[PDB]
Amino acid sequence: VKYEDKICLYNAKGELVEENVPLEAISPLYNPTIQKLVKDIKRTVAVNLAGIENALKTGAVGGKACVIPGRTLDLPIVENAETIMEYVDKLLRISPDDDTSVKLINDGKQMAVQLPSKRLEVAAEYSISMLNTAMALKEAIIKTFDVDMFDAPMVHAAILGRYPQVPDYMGANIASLLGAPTNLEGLGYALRNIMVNHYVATTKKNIMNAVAFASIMEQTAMFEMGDAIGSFERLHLLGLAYQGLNADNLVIDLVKANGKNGTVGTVVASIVERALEDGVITEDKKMPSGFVLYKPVDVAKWNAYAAAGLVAAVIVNCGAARAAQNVASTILYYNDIIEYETGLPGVDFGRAEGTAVGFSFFSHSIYGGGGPGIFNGNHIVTRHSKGFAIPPVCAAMCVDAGTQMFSPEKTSALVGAVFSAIDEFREPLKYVIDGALAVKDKI
Amino acid sequence: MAVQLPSKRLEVAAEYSISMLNTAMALKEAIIKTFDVDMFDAPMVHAAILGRYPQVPDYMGANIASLLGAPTNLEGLGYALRNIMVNHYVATTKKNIMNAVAFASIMEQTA
Amino acid sequence: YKPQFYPGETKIAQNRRNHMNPEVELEKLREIPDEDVVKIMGHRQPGEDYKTIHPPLEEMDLPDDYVRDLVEPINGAKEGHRIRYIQFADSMYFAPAQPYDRARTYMWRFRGVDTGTLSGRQVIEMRESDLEALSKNFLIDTAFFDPARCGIRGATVHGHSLRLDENGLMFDALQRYVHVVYVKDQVGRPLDEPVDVGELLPEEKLREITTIYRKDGVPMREDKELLTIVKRIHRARTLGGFCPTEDTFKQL
Amino acid sequence: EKKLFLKALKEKFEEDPKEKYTKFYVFGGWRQSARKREFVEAAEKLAEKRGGIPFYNPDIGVPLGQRKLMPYKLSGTDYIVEGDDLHFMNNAAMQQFWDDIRRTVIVGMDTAHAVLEKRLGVEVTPETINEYMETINHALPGGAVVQEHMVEVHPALAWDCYAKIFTGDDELADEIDKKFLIDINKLFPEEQAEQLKAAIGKRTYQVSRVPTLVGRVCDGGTIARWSAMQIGMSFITAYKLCAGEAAIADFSYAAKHADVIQMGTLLPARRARGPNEPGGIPFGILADVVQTTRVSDDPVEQSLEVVASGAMLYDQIWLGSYMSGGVGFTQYATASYTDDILDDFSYYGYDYVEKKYGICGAKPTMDVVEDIATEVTLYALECYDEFPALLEDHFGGSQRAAVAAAASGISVCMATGNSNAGLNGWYLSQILHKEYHSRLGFYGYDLQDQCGASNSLSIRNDESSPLELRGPNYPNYAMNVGHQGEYAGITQAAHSARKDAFALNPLIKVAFADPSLVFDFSHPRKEFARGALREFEPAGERDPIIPA
Amino acid sequence: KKLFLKALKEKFEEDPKEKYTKFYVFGGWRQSARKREFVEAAEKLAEKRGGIPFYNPDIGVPLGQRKLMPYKLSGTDYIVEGDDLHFMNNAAMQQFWDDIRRTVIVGMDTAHAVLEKRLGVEVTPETINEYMETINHALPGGAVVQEHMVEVHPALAWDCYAKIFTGDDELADEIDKKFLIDINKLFPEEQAEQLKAAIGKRTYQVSRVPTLVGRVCDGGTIARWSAMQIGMSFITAYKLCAGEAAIADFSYAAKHADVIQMGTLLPARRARGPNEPGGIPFGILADVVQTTRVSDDPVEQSLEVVASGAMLYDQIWLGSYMSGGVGFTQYATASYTDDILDDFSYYGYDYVEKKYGICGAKPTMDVVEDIATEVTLYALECYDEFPALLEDHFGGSQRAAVAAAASGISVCMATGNSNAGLNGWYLSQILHKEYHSRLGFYGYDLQDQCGASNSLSIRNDESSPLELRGPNYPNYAMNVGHQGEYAGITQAAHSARKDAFALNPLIKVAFADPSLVFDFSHPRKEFARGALREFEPAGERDPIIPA
């Protein structure tokens, strides 16, 4: 117990679970389910057996529109998904009691491969999961269908794509939630390279679950990046609890208060009132014209409250329009209003606003970006805010009625189907609360 | 100095570069708080520890080192444990043939 | 809690506060029929049905989400109408409305808003059905717009920072406006039916309604309150970025 | 039978090609060459411009011309050029060959049309397509379309820049003007055009060629970005949408990531480069750049024309400059496309295959690979033995090993139609060549050849790949000369035997069939001859903005 | 009198204080001499390109609805057309970048140590001069050890050479004047003493590879091209075995251990090798510009660096490499045309000299806040007093960049701290936003809203002295009207201190070389020469192409 701070745990439905919970019970350094989420993300791979079969049958391997004539292989892979599953398990398993898991999805058209944790314990990075699964698949297919020596390279091309010529996965039929280590924007950015659409697809468009999932990952990445070291730790912990894990039902209460006829401004007024009420902020000086300049009592807790209000404002505004495209404007002017309403710094001391400025630019211009769901913490446009801008973006894509061209239905079909099946991934907030109550007194 | 992060920090980390980042941050805060370094001078402390980061995606002119190179300089996927210089193996083993062979072989085969 | 909206001692800052204040309903200085508005917008002809991008929410099989269903969607989202826009280029020469002023006002007064601030243009993207309604009821009707100083333009927005013409109107490379009467839609396509927007306000009349600081008008250096607030925000951001501790924040 | 390299050898040497004796040190050194004289004279004329700073001097180091300095006759042509004129720095055609590839980018238009009709509600008609195509050919060379007070790029520097359209849907092709369309039916033979349209399907693609000057001032990574901006601008003008809204970001994502086809991919940190660099171009894609397939029914000619383009790009430009620099690797490449030596070896192999297995007559087996590769290698090395003059032409062991193994590999592909079978044949040729003369190539020529046999038919993550998907970034191939170009040749040989229209990407095959290109990709060797004789006019020259 | 008045004179026919003018009466595009040449050239070239349409002003926007402005380059009496300041139409701008790209510095001490310690071959000035005479034959593409070698045409590589420089004066005197970049002969005595004190007794080789190489290939080729020939020259000038164990040490030194490159490599999303504009930090670019050793004027030095910076980072880098098309010419011109930034920076300098004195105040929040507010207020009141000046800088981004540049430069003039000036810049941006209720384009302030927090931050990807920041710094990786001005603020911190260099003294010495095509002492005047087509660049293929 390094911090005196206490939090009340409320769920996705707004029901109270437990009171007087230490803040550190939600820390990635103590919470067991957050540890399970990281471990599982690193060891889970989504396999498209249907894709591998179609790629081998047509000879369409190595990226977009690339086809090799005369190298076709007609193999009943999907039909024999059972034997392939058993083969993949036999190759990846160490002991008959480890977490090695190979599950068939959508009538054997897709597979969900989970490496035993021990393989990762002796691995420097996460890319092992993609490599070992690919190898396990090649050997499984080649041995089952007695594939000839001169044809076997096409099996590799159907699974891994244009590797090793391309230092990325190009035209591959196996996917992870994490991108290649070579596409990292900075050091320790690995857990930020999760597309918004992937979070939304996995959580099955559940706002609270998507916010929780994105916040958990973004904040755990802030610890990996070293941004949560020392004096900054308490800022990110309060950020994670109030913004992502609905601490004291703050997010929900703000949505409840402004969901009916409330605007972004009304949410700003609601959070300022609650912040003043809880003694998080106070009046510095009364100025001419009657404007009161405010000063923070608890800088870290003020940012946490403001961050919670940001998620709430996105839910309210994007929810009123049922369009995800609004998020970039919402994040911007939520922060812009809150600064000229109180004279206090915005979420992430303007970084969240700055991110939103670039986000608006790269979601309404010719220079780059795209639709809200295409972004991630590792994108050049949305890396600036230290875990406070991506979770609200997830809430906008959850709300969207279908305005977007690049929807999770188009970008995250495979990943969505595999990860939504896992209980902790689909409903993170629920298991994170249970995990907080599991280590509550142990800290 | 020889800094060893608690294993738990790596258990919640996707890669190994956390050790270099957390130590650098721990050092900055240690030096700044001990010597009461001014706000306008503190960026030089960062530059003295991490070098030309974040302008360079590598460690350029840094005063902290690891046996493992940056994840961005990987020749292929899963090559991380292979990015250990021959001289590093020999220096660590104190020029003992059997120990250097063992160390290089362990790392190469685990990779 | 009663909102403060914006800091500042001057009337310019007070006009910004009045614009942001949803309780303050400014006078209808002009009257433009809705049919003429729809034609200026140019996304559909008056009488043409509303184009739908997605089916109505009432017919969508959405799973249970307690939090999601706390937000009552706007009228345009309920029927699943198309997302269209309206863009304004405000003159730096005493225009009643300004880019960041517009954005702050929209985010304070309206629901389901997607607005974009730029130096030479200010876009507002919303559900077509409610957008026409808000364009007509606020943007067109209220004291916010001046036909001579606020030009409606979707493309070729150049003119916000340019000198006025021989008449006193703002520059328009597509001459959308020429009584102040528009001849073309915001895109550039000439209208078969021109639209009269009414009279223009003289410079001397616009000084008391404008939301811009100018030397010839109200210099910003005269408003020391606003300057103290900006300097405060800048300092708070700097200190916060350096160390987010209460000890450092004593240097405010 | 009659040998093919005799017509170039007798025209090169005064002695009988079979004679193992000659006189030396009696040619006057460097003075024997007309080009060396021009070099020593231009170095004297320019000595004024550099200040007192020394420049090109043949007295420094090795006295060149002790040996008979050989000219070079480009294979399949009657052009006999000087050795120094085949260096890429002195050859404008070679530079334009690379410049044309580098400035090429293909963008899928279907996704963008879907954004217009499904999200914006704007109908896409051939009339709007032709207008878009009229607008892009004004914006792509650097012309303003929506903003006031815009500067513009001088059209005399961007005449080579244009944007064409091609489609597999013949209903859409007829509704487009002949000026803007790359007609698959008008450019390709009946069979080939049908195979291409069957592979492409009912999908419309835009081929944008950015001005040569851009890739020259900047890099290859600029091309896809330059194209994307102007594509985005043209959809704003030709459809009169808002000059910056939510749907525009979708056009950017499709043009830059989702529907883009680039010549080359990015590279790792040690050889860090953006897309559209030679290193990122796979052997299959380069084989599809070369248009000899649609102008000749000769399978050997097709393969060898790809070898010419490959050895020049990969060994001269890529490994000789990008990866090394200096004097470069001109002769390492020339050996593959000069004096009809590789032609003779590949034709012998083709005639051996035809009379034993037949073209595509044998399924790939170890015994087939071993038989063909051994026979072609033995013939090749016995030709160097029967002709001391031929051995004198290919003085470097690397050049001999590359040529012998290229023909061996091509022949295996002529019999099997499998790129990996030909690749395995290549490695056996290298092992045999090493034991024949008790020598192979330079100090480290066989790194990939000793790893070869094991990685040719491997299934491991960084070892496996069909030769079409291999390239200059394949681990074993990332460093050494006399391999990459010949591998593209073996890749073409597998498909030439099968009478295939394309090898890996049909969009590349269609894109480079375009007569609007500066370089003629149908006859690369003849074009290198034109560049060597300074008869070739390239693009990207700054004469309109430079004082005369 | 305001400095932009004498420059606004030939631009506008009316009084700069006039809020009214006439429009739609200029005959459109036909008002410009350049546009006429463009249309005419598009008609002449129509045959050679086939029936394929080309440049046509009738397509899209009718240009010339307003008086199309020419541009007078700051500090010069040259008034050029707007289109001539575009990097594609300007040969001087292309050669500026080409000269930087083809530059590479290699430490010679390590290579000489291999010769003496390992090989046993003694290194004497006689062998150095022989090496330097061999490298100037090998570097442009000349054979030295192998028989039957082809060669590069010398008329395409006349711009290529290799010079030597050293901090040890006892070694400098024993080298030919032709091969040496004399620090004493090129720099003033005090600056040369500061440079030699920073360099120390270390010998460096500056190799300039032919322009044609960087044009055909890329920046990543340069260090490799230099390394091969350095290796070759050591084999020949020291009569070594043509391939032995010690040769590999020369390769490692020239390519990794002792190499100094202009720019570093970039991450996957903007993947590029070394020697690309993105990898060049603000400190290094400030050291490329040689205005410091030809002028005692601190403001001129800073603004000349702004000129070089805005043109490289916004026009070449962000306008082409990162975007392409019409580009960002006007976004950059605003920083080095009509003496507007000059007037604002001079006002700020005179304000500083009065209230604090140059390097008179230690960096504090109160100092930063006072200077940054005053300079911004003056700047925005100048746009208010002159509707014509506001008409010149029509784009909000241009105004914000200029106002904040002068604000930041002024803070650096008073403090001598790059990060203090950087903080001043961010306050100027926040103030400018509340002044006119507008700033720049849609996403101009991403880095400005993250600015104040990351200016004095200590976090791993937020912290860095401005000298070590560059186009790859997270917040600066995308947007225009920042990078060039940041290089200017970086120069301003050292200009106030009367420093010889800002970050790397080897760069300062390397670019002082008169053998370079572009004149780095006067970048603005050289851009004027390029705009008027009186600049002759290198890398032209005229000796190998038909007339």
Ligand code: F43
């Ligand atoms: C279509 C866009 C959306 C987008 O993504 N970029 C555009 C256009 C793009 C194009 C214009 C191409 C053409 O004319 O064919 C280019 C030149 C980049 C390119 N593609 O090569 C550019 N802008 Ni724009 N763009 C500019 C600017 C601007 C200013 C113009 C304000 C005004 O009142 O005129 C505004 C932003 C703002 O309001 O702050 C702006 C927006 C816009 N800019 C709006 C067009 C608005 C309109 O309808 O006129 N640019 C500037 O702020 C000045 C420099 C100028 C750039 C050209 C140069 O630097 O040489 C150009 C930079």
Ligand SMILES: C[C@@H](OP(=O)(O)O)[C@H](NC(=O)CCCCCCS)C(=O)O
């Ligand atoms: C965001 C990113 O684009 P993507 O979203 O990856 O397509 C990136 N663009 C840029 O940073 C463009 C910079 C130049 C144009 C904008 C000037 S404000 C790039 O092309 O690598």
Ligand SMILES: O=S(=O)(O)CCS
């Ligand atoms: O002599 S080496 O084999 O090292 C180089 C051949 S060019």
Ligand SMILES: O=S(=O)(O)CCS
């Ligand atoms: O209009 S945008 O601000 O997106 C681009 C300005 S060039």
Ligand SMILES: [K+]
């Ligand atoms: K180039």
